Amino acid sequence: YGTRTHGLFKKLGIPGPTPLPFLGNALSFRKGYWTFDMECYKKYGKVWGIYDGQQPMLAITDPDMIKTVLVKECYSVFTNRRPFGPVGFMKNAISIAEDEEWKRIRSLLSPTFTSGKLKEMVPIIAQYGDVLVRNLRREAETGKPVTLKHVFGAYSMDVITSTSFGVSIDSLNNPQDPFVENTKKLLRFNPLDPFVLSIKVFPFLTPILEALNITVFPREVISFLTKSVKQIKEGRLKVDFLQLMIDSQNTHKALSDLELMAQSIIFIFAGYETTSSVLSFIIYELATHPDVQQKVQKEIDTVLPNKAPPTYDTVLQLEYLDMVVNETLRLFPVAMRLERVCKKDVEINGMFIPKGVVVMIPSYVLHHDPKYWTEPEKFLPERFSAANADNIDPYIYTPFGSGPRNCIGMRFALVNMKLALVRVLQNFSFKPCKETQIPLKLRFGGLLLTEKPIVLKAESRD
Amino acid sequence: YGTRTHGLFKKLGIPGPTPLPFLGNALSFRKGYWTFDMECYKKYGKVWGIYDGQQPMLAITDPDMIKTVLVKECYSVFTNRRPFGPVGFMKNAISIAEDEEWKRIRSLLSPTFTSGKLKEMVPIIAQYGDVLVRNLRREAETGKPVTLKHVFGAYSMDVITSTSFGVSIDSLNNPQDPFVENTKKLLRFNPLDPFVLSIKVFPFLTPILEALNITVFPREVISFLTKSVKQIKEGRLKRVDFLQLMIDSQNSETHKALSDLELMAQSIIFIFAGYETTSSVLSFIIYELATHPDVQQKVQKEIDTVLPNKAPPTYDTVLQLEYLDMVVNETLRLFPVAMRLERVCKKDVEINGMFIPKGVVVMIPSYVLHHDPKYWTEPEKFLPERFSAANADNIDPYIYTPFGSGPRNCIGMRFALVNMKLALVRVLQNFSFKPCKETQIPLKLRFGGLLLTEKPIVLKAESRD
Ligand code: HEM
Ligand code: HEM
Numbered sequence: 043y044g045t046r047t048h049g050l051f052k053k054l055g056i057p058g059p060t061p062l063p064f065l066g067n068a069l070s071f072r073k074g075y076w077t078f079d080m081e082c083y084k085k086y087g088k089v090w091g092i093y094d095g096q097q098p099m100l101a102i103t104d105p106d107m108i109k110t111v112l113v114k115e116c117y118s119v120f121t122n123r124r125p126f127g128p129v130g131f132m133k134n135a136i137s138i139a140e141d142e143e144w145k146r147i148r149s150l151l152s153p154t155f156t157s158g159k160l161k162e163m164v165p166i167i168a169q170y171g172d173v174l175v176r177n178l179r180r181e182a183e184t185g186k187p188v189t190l191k192h193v194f195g196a197y198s199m200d201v202i203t204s205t206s207f208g209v210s211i212d213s214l215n216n217p218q219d220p221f222v223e224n225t226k227k228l229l230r231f232n233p234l235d236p237f238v239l240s241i242k243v244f245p246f247l248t249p250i251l252e253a254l255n256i257t258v259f260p261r262e263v264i265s266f267l268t269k270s271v272k273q274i275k276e277g278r279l280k281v282d283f284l285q286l287m288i289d290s291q292n293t294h295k296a297l298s299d300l301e302l303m304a305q306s307i308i309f310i311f312a313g314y315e316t317t318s319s320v321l322s323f324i325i326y327e328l329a330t331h332p333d334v335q336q337k338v339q340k341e342i343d344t345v346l347p348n349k350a351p352p353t354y355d356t357v358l359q360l361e362y363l364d365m366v367v368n369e370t371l372r373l374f375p376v377a378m379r380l381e382r383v384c385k386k387d388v389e390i391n392g393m394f395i396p397k398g399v400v401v402m403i404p405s406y407v408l409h410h411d412p413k414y415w416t417e418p419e420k421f422l423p424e425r426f427s428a429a430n431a432d433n434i435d436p437y438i439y440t441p442f443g444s445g446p447r448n449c450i451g452m453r454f455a456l457v458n459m460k461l462a463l464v465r466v467l468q469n470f471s472f473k474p475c476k477e478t479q480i481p482l483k484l485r486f487g488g489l490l491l492t493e494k495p496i497v498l499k500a501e502s503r504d
Numbered sequence: 505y506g507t508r509t510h511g512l513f514k515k516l517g518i519p520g521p522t523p524l525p526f527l528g529n530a531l532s533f534r535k536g537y538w539t540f541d542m543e544c545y546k547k548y549g550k551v552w553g554i555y556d557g558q559q560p561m562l563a564i565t566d567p568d569m570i571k572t573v574l575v576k577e578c579y580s581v582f583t584n585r586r587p588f589g590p591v592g593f594m595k596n597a598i599s600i601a602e603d604e605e606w607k608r609i610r611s612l613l614s615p616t617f618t619s620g621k622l623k624e625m626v627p628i629i630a631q632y633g634d635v636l637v638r639n640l641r642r643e644a645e646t647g648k649p650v651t652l653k654h655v656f657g658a659y660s661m662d663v664i665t666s667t668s669f670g671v672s673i674d675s676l677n678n679p680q681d682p683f684v685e686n687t688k689k690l691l692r693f694n695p696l697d698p699f700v701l702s703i704k705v706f707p708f709l710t711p712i713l714e715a716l717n718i719t720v721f722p723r724e725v726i727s728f729l730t731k732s733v734k735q736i737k738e739g740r741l742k743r744v745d746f747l748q749l750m751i752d753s754q755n756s757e758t759h760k761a762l763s764d765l766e767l768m769a770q771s772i773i774f775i776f777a778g779y780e781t782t783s784s785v786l787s788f789i790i791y792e793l794a795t796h797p798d799v800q801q802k803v804q805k806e807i808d809t810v811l812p813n814k815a816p817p818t819y820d821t822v823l824q825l826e827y828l829d830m831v832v833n834e835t836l837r838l839f840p841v842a843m844r845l846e847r848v849c850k851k852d853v854e855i856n857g858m859f860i861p862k863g864v865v866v867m868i869p870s871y872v873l874h875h876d877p878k879y880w881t882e883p884e885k886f887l888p889e890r891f892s893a894a895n896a897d898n899i900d901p902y903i904y905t906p907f908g909s910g911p912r913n914c915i916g917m918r919f920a921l922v923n924m925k926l927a928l929v930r931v932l933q934n935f936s937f938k939p940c941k942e943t944q945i946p947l948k949l950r951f952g953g954l955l956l957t958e959k960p961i962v963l964k965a966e967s968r969d
Pocket of ligand 2: 598599600610664773774777778779781782785841842845846905906907908909910911912913914915916917919920
């Protein structure tokens with residue numbers, strides 16, 4: 043059985059590495075998606091095929107073909123991401139929903155994510171930057187090297203859990219909060235636990251598992267979180283994501299109470315580790331590039347002198363900080379790849395793609411490709427200067443994806459990271475210490491991970 | 505899921521090759537079980553551990569340990585073979601049955617395999633020797649090379665199908681016989697078709713399949729064969745083959761009789777157990793005679809002494825062919841066509857100083873132990889004299905196991921040895937064998953459920969006088 047699809051790419055003449063029975067090419071992933079994808083690009087060229095168990099995946103690098111997949115043919119042919127598999131009510135989560143159901147949910151949610159509602163949301167979220175400074179100061183004053191994940195992760199989880207669930211939380215300075223302990227538990231679910239990695243090898247189990255109400259999600263942890271958010275909703279009727287969705291419940295039928303909870307949960311899964319990782323990578327680049335850090339601090343000092351609290355409108359003016367964030371995301375696109383399932387046979391941009399193949403856009407490869415970037419391993423924020431905008435193809439540079447199924451939280455994530463970076467750089471200056479892994483090494487994971495934690499030394503300003 | 509047992513040999517201090525998720529070490533078998541077992545013996549020592557999918561298998565080479573597994577702790581701990589998996593009524597076949605069910609059917613079949621009953625069966629079986637000679641004469645007389653499998657396969661099938669189903673068949677000279685075509689279709693099933701090899705990667709599917717009455721065997725053929733045997737059973741009601749002996753047994757002692765359905769299952773399993781084994785060994789024996797002309801001559805000399813002037817072989821005369829027994833035994837040493845024995849460990853135990861956990865399969869590498877210089881002098885040389893009476897105490901019966909050992913050993917051993925001798929006598933009374941341009945020397949083996957040759961064995965056969 044373990045070989046039935048393994049002839050597909052050879053029959054179509056798409057190059058690729060030879061798959062093993064049952065495993066496909068999965069063992070080759072374990073050195074990291076980013077290195078495996080690049081190796082395939084270097085040796086097979088513009089297009090290649092691989093197998094993740096029995097699932098074939100076609101890699102594409104042509105920006106015209108990528109626009110066709112991500113944009114033009116999104117609703118018709120390439121509408122859904124790969125299942126993973128047995129879920130329950132989390133079928134309603136915007137990132138898991140498919141076809142017409144996804145379209146309704148993305149539509150219901152678009153009001154919640156406008157820049158206008160974001161601007162209204164900032165004053166409640168600037169508060170969490172104060173906790174970050176408190177947490178960082180407590181770690182950095184002892185003279186010790188700081189583990190960036192500890193404080194930036196706490197900031198990421200505090201901000202996204204608070205606005206998604208409607209509950210101010212402080213994970214470090216109040217770890218006994220049930221919400222902290224439970225949300226922490228929730229976040230233990232990784233798409234790389236041995237349950238998911240077995241479903242990929244025999245995906246025919248999902249129908250049986252769903253017939254038995256088995257889910258890959260922590261059923262108990264979600265049961266408590268739902269039963270707790272129920273009480274908040276009933277008390278609140280006597281500007282976070284929870285309120286915005288509540289307000290939208292009165293073309294598409296409004297969100298059900300169950301559909302809303304699925305959104306709140308998926309926001310945390312989507313926002314926690316991405317934002318945490320990217321914040322750490324940004325500070326790492328700043329530490330290893332003093333004069334870039336110096337120029338960020340000068341600019342912050344210009345718009346927000348004397349540790350003035352950041353606002354939407356002021357953060358919106360940190361154009362250089364924007365370039366620094368954009369250049370960090372080129373080097374470390376934490377999702378690595380984009381994926382779409384082909385719903386039917388098509389020929390696009392000179393290539394036939396059979397039904398059921400997963401199209402894969404290797405963002406990391408395109409971000410690091412010398413064809414599109416000079417010295418692509420160099421951290422040069424100037425690539426994202428206003429004047430170099432014509433030379434950046436939005437199908438080559440895709441840290442938040444593209445098209446109708448892109449990151450719906452991109453604008454919130456950028457502002458949120460700038461709010462935190464401002465606070466922290468208003469008060470501190472980062473520098474490599476003894477334990478800092480330089481150059482940084484990456485490690486296998488669902489997202490871009492570091493081999494060893496990023497440790498720097500943080501010095502107070504004045 | 506794909507590694508759930510893969511730490512087990514590490515955790516026990518037992519060495520072995522690093523297994524892959526889901527597959528275990530299975531990709532390494534495809535070069536041949538015999539060559540894989542020997543490689544593991546060389547580089548890992550007396551004991552080693554492998555994984556066939558999720559199933560851990562422990563190889564042992566110590567005769568004392570082998571004798572604990574095969575003999576002492578057989579009914580208590582090492583009772584059953586590995587399943588393969590979904591089977592229907594064939595659960596009653598002796599080789600597949602387990603625990604008290606196996607103990608029952610093996611006891612009901614013991615009367616049928618006594619040497620007395622064997623002797624009463626030879627007058628009926630010697631006939632297929634004449635058919636064998638006729639088929640060989642037709643191929644050999646043109647002076648062409650003869651493909652040993654073609655006549656020896658036919659003989660083995662004719663013999664085992666005739667005595668198991670109770671009809672005389674002649675596969676070559678009457679190939680449109682419906683029994684021939686169906687038995688040939690039945691034997692198409694091999695323990696290596698991809699269905700049984702996917703069940704090994706996910707064994708939890710077997711209960712599902714059995715709930716759906718799905719079977720790994722060809723239900724098609726077994727249906728027609730059962731209906732055919734039933735008509736035969738009524739004609740006899742108004743006579744010494746395996747069918748009769750199991751019918752007669754149907755007439756309590758320590759166990760209830762065989763049901764008609766249990767009887768059919770044994771007839772089917774007899775053909776699976778005896779067809780390809782008997783064919784391959786007969787060809788290996790003729791290959792050794794052709795490549796060792798003196799041994800052939802000495803064998804013929806003994807045959808002419810006991811059965812002068814082409815006298816037909818009988819049970820009492822074939823019993824007198826002491827040197828022919830040496831040849832057969834030496835051939836089976838070089839070519840133990842089963843390669844290995846296996847037993848499932850029913851429960852935790854510690855035998856001769858080694859702990860073995862529940863659910864492991866213990867494996868005895870017969871082929872490894874037959875070619876092991878630790879126990880044989882020049883083990884690659886074909887020397888029939890290791891089995892002379894003067895050298896009886898030099899043959900450890902847990903090192904030399906072409907028929908297995910203990911209560912779960914090959915119940916057809918004695919029939920097999922006599923059946924082969926009946927065949928070799930007729931053939932060696934009428935022909936001498938010689939290598940030709942196409943005889944692969946030395947013989948190259950190939951991967952399979954039994955020991956197979958790379959290329960078919962092809963020899964020249966000259967008639968005597
Ligand atoms: C730096 C932080 C983040 C990064 C780098 C990131 C990256 C991505 C990427 C690459 C995708 C796939 C888009 C595609 O396939 O085209 C995605 C999807 C998504 N992200 Fe983000 N994300 C981040 C933060 C967030 C936040 C804060 C939220 C919510 C508040 C969020 C919610 C989502 C959702 C719901 C989807 C699925 C969209 C859909 O299927 O309609 N993400 N993200
Ligand atoms: C050259 C011929 C043959 C060889 C080399 C051979 C070899 C073997 C071996 C190695 C075993 C496994 C024993 C163990 O696991 O300890 C076995 C089992 C068996 N053989 Fe034979 N065999 C031959 C012919 C036959 C014939 C002709 C029959 C039937 C008349 C037969 C019936 C069986 C049965 C029923 C079993 C399973 C018995 C049980 O599990 O209790 N075999 N054979």
